[PDB]
Amino acid sequence: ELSFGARAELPRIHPVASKLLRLMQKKETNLCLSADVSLARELLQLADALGPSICMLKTHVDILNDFTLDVMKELITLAKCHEFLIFEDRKFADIGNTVKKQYEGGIFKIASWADLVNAHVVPGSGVVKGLQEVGLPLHRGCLLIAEMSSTGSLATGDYTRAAVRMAEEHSEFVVGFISGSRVSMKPEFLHLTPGVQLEAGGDNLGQQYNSPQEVIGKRGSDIIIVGRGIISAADRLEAAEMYRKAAWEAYLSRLG
Amino acid sequence: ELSFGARAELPRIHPVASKLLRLMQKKETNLCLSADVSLARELLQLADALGPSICMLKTHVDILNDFTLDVMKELITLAKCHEFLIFEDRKFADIGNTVKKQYEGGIFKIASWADLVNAHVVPGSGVVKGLQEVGLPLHRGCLLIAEMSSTGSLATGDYTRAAVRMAEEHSEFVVGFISGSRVSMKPEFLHLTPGVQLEAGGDNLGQQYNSPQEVIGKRGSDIIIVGRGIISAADRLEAAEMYRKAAWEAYLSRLG
Ligand SMILES: O=C(O)c1cc(=O)[nH]c(=O)n1[C@@H]1O[C@H](COP(=O)(O)O)[C@@H](O)[C@H]1O
Numbered sequence: 001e002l003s004f005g006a007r008a009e010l011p012r013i014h015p016v017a018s019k020l021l022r023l024m025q026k027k028e029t030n031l032c033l034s035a036d037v038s039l040a041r042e043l044l045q046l047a048d049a050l051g052p053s054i055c056m057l058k059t060h061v062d063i064l065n066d067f068t069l070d071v072m073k074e075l076i077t078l079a080k081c082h083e084f085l086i087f088e089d090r091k092f093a094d095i096g097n098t099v100k101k102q103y104e105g106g107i108f109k110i111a112s113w114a115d116l117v118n119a120h121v122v123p124g125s126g127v128v129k130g131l132q133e134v135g136l137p138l139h140r141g142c143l144l145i146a147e148m149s150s151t152g153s154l155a156t157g158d159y160t161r162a163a164v165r166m167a168e169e170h171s172e173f174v175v176g177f178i179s180g181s182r183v184s185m186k187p188e189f190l191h192l193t194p195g196v197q198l199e200a201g202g203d204n205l206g207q208q209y210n211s212p213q214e215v216i217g218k219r220g221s222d223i224i225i226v227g228r229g230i231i232s233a234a235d236r237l238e239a240a241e242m243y244r245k246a247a248w249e250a251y252l253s254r255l256g
Numbered sequence: 257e258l259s260f261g262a263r264a265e266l267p268r269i270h271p272v273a274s275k276l277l278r279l280m281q282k283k284e285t286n287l288c289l290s291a292d293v294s295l296a297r298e299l300l301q302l303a304d305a306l307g308p309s310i311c312m313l314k315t316h317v318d319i320l321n322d323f324t325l326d327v328m329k330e331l332i333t334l335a336k337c338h339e340f341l342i343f344e345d346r347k348f349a350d351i352g353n354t355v356k357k358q359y360e361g362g363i364f365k366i367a368s369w370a371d372l373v374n375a376h377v378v379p380g381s382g383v384v385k386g387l388q389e390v391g392l393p394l395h396r397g398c399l400l401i402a403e404m405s406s407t408g409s410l411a412t413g414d415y416t417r418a419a420v421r422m423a424e425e426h427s428e429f430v431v432g433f434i435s436g437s438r439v440s441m442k443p444e445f446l447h448l449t450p451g452v453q454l455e456a457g458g459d460n461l462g463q464q465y466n467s468p469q470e471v472i473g474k475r476g477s478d479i480i481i482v483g484r485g486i487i488s489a490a491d492r493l494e495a496a497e498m499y500r501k502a503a504w505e506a507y508l509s510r511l512g
């Protein structure tokens with residue numbers, strides 16, 4: 001098993017994965033903030049204050065009541081200043097011809113500002129081929145959704161294996177997974193795990209939580225994605241630091 | 257087998273399904289236009305000219321370069337005038353807590369103008385529960401994606417059966433399917449089938465085509481969804497009429 005810093009140098013590493021792994025090692029963070037807010041001002045204030053604590057800020061641009069491309073410009077300024085990637089959690093899941101347009105165009109122009117996006121594998125590999133036609137020229141990366149945190153998820157068994165094959169066959173663009181665990185044995189791929197809180201529980205709409213120690217330490221994932229565990233806390237900076245320290249020590253203890 | 261007009265009166269019919277089935281029978285159309293354009297002016301000119309020929313206009317609001325809520329007000333005026341449903345093909349596919357916000361809020365406010373949306377079933381039934389908490393109060397309907405037209409689709413076998421169960425267990429909100437065929441034996445549910453052209457072929461990104469006669473007549477679906485077969489034609493009105501007559505006759509001939 002290699003450190004994040006050594007994985008950043010692997011022969012087959014994608015440039016976006018390398019950039020991420022280098023700043024994870026530099027900053028001692030494997031925390032992705034899920035910035036699940038409706039106000040641009042709150043998004044930017046969280047990005048600025050928590051930027052030093054995170055390797056990545058995950059957006060849902062389509063829930064931002066006051067989205068503009070200028071808001072995204074300000075988010076990029078903060079991402080460059082504090083050194084984190086921007087991940088738009090759009091979950092592309094249509095035919096290749098459609099997702100190419102959804103990624104490049106419309107009002108969001110996601111590819112213009114998102115380092116990373118993700119896709120469901122259920123439509124077959126055309127979803128990746130469509131995205132990669134926009135994303136490769138724009139030097140972007142993609143994550144494939146191999147496992148899901150929600151109750152009744154059908155992303156199990158052969159489905160998860162199909163996601164890993166699709167990633168490993170599109171390594172020029174696919175840099176890793178949304179998963180609950182290590183699903184690829186190839187260290188070039190990132191594993192990002194949502195459904196994370198320090199305490200046991202869930203929500204009223206099928207979300208299930210596991211701890212940073214469980215998903216990084218026992219299940220072998222790389223990065224925790226945390227929304228409400230941070231966003232609903234009074235002091236979001238201290239909450240981010242709690243999650244960062246938990247995920248980082250779980251990673252170190254797996255390394256030995 | 258019942259006519260569209262008789263299905264509109266079934267005891268367990270959803271009001272949105274009933275409205276659709278009545279206008280299908282009245283207008284002799286089971287064609288859904290896939291309005292896959294980037295200009296509001298082209299969207300509205302297609303909606304006005306093709307409105308009489310269609311039961312439904314399917315949008316991808318996120319590929320419109322000049323989206324505003326006032327464009328959607330103008331589309332509703334045309335939908336009311338010509339009598340067709342608006343279906344936003346958003347393919348919700350996240351945890352319930354997230355999709356509720358993606359459906360109601362952000363820039364698009366999809367639930368405010370879309371009669372129908374659709375969802376992938378891969379996250380489990382929380383995706384439907386989250387949507388239905390916005391959609392039920394707003395008297396909307398939802399389609400579940402049981403089968404997909406694209407090469408390598410994983411929406412087969414047990415996955416398709418899971419989509420049908422999830423629909424039949426959420427009948428207060430789910431009114432049917434995106435599918436390639438009849439997948440439910442319950443006549444209250446609508447089957448809408450994309451991947452339709454008169455000629456054999458596909459696209460360069462995994463789209464596969466079947467004819468209206470195949471999907472309505474042999475495979476037992478209700479509605480054809482047609483994009484490029486109409487949109488790329490010179491005379492989009494005549495193309496819509498050719499698809500409408502094909503789908504309608506295939507429906508009549510299965511009815512006997
Ligand atoms: O792609 C994701 O990040 C995602 C996948 C998944 O399996 N589960 C999951 O919860 N998510 C997202 O991660 C975040 C979870 O947030 P919290 O439950 O508030 O921590 C939400 O924004 C979800 O949309």
Ligand SMILES: O=C(O)c1cc(=O)[nH]c(=O)n1[C@@H]1O[C@H](COP(=O)(O)O)[C@@H](O)[C@H]1O
Pocket residue numbers: 094095098290292314316345374403404405406434450451452463481482483484485
């Ligand atoms: O949900 C859909 O309508 C959809 C599902 C599917 O399995 N296949 C599919 O092609 N679609 C959509 O239907 C349209 C097909 O357009 P054409 O290939 O141009 O006729 C596109 O807008 C797709 O996003």
